[PDB]
């Protein structure tokens, strides 16, 4: 559900 995973 991230959408922009690297932002995590």
């Amino acid at each position, epitope marked *: 559900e*991230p959408q922009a995973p*690297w932002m995590e």
Partner: antibody
Amino acid sequence: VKLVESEGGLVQPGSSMKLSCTASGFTFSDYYMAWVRQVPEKGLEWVANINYDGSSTYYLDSLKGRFIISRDIAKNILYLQMSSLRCEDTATYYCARLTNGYLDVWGAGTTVTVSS
Amino acid sequence: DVVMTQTPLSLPVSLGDQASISCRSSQSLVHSNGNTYLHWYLQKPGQSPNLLIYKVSNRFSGVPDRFSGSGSGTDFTLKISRVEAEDLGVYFCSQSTHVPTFGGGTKLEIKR
């Protein structure tokens, strides 16, 4: 479907410009959005992205905050403000829809040329 | 800074034969959340890239079963079975597990 970028074109070094991208066919604020750019000789480079409501953004670090990605949810529009342009910013810019880490809809691309 | 290295730079193939394209990453693409954000795009001549395969092996809507993605960790492969002329163009891998980056592309050439 469909994402349509504004006309790009010529900009003088050191000057500023704003691209827009108009989206149709989906619940706009239901999807993240992104900008990617392509040079010849060559290679694709991720430029920026923005979450559903615009409260969180990501930028390619080397841009040093010169670019701003934003979205008008009331007009279904995505913007890329570009400031203090150098020749290295010359490229084809693509608007894209971002879902679960991948770009599942791309625009036609618009070229930006930074030249005196 | 994760580097995506694609092999070969250009790939000639006969119609009906299979093409295999390699994409390696310089760091594991397994995210902490368990997903591998490795994707494949095709850019046909005079066109924008379009999504082919997402998250290693998932075909995007409209992509035929001829296109198959596989691999894990740092090593990935795109296989195109029974190549048709309209398959030609540049195939790019991309990762978004980390700060997102793209491979340099592999050009599929059709033999005649």
